[PDB]
Amino acid sequence: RVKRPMNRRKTKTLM
Amino acid sequence: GVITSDMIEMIFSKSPEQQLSATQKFRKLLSKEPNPPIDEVISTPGVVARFVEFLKRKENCTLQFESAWVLTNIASGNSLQTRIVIQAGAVPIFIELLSSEFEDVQEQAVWALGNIAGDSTMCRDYVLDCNILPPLLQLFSKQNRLTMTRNAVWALSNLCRGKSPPPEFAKVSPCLNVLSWLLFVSDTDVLADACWALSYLSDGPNDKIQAVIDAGVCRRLVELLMHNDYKVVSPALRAVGNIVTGDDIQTQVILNCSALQSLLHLLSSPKESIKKEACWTISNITAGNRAQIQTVIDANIFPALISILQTAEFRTRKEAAWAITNATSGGSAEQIKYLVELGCIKPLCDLLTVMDSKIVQVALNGLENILRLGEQEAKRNGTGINPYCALIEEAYGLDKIEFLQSHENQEIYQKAFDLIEHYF
């Protein structure tokens, strides 16, 4: 009720 | 220039030797650290589809591997570049490749799907619509390989990621059990991405957090609050803070795991991010019944919150102020007494001269709770005068309240007037 709420990619390299 | 004609020739050659040669040339040229030439490979209309076609070559394991690597890197770029991969039809092929006999291939498949689902809500839901998770979840049955388990939990986190709009909950909820026993692993990367998936699934109505509670993870989450690597503590703290956004029963679940003890430790962490999210978790806790407020008290949290309110950055001080204010809203007459005994009047008053209007209102109502209680103690009439009207004056409080008359915000100005008239 009184609660307040809160407020990706990987490249591949051989090296 | 960047893509010699020899490459396209070998790519469309029917000799597997040359096919592989040119495909791995593309792979190497896309593994560049600064900026691989994604737009250059997409500008040759018939190569991306050609790679998609190579993915179906079960005869040759190396060729699907290299092609999947190329396509992962292409899918690691902008949204347009991955839309090229999608409308080339690569998603169902990758999903079928999850069940491949060759392990390198299925690892690259889950990586590609992780990048694709990590694009946007539309790509995420599209990958979900292709039935990704039934073959994805069986991948954890083999505890043999580590790199694969890492890639799998990260792809899962992408499938759960996004709140605008959230994924279809029934579509991604069946991964709760596998996450539940994935929290007992040793590797930090797997733990971190598992906690991230749990943090995403816990962001929502009390129904979704109730589901993840029914998965039985709160205990291991709080045990991970004390993890040594912050890559694990950040998302674990976030997931716990999400759970404590529910009703009293489901936050009491977190309290029964003895979480306040470790949250107190996190209130001293050097990372201000963790300090802030711990203050936020505790504020949500102190918005509850008198017993949850009391267990926050008996954990000796309010000393640390008052300290943080005096010396921390403003972003953190906000959540600390919400914590003590919430404790003053629905607290016992003796609990707020403990608060003022600790000396919370000076911090709240110090918060009145600040720019942010909303937390000024926070401090105002947090003081008005103390004033009203003090007036209720005065209603007893053992002593006529309100005892707190002098304690707030000694802290230069009414000075700042008076200044709040000239405040632009009508709510703040009017509230200051009401207070000065009623209690002074």
Author numbering:
A (entry chain B): 40 to 46, 113 to 120
B (entry chain A): 81 to 504
Publication passage describing the model:
SOX2 is essential for the neural development, and the self-renewal of undifferentiated embryonic and neural stem cells. SOX2 is one of the key factors required to convert somatic cells into induced pluripotent stem cells (PSCs), and in concert with Nanog and Oct4, plays a central role in embryonic stem cell maintenance. The localization of proteins to the nucleus via the classical import pathway is an active process and requires a cargo bearing an NLS to be recognized by importin-α (IMPα). Humans harbor seven IMPα isoforms (IMPα1–7), each containing an N-terminal IMPβ-binding domain (residues 1–70) and a C-terminal NLS-binding domain constructed from ten armadillo (ARM) repeats (residues 70–500).
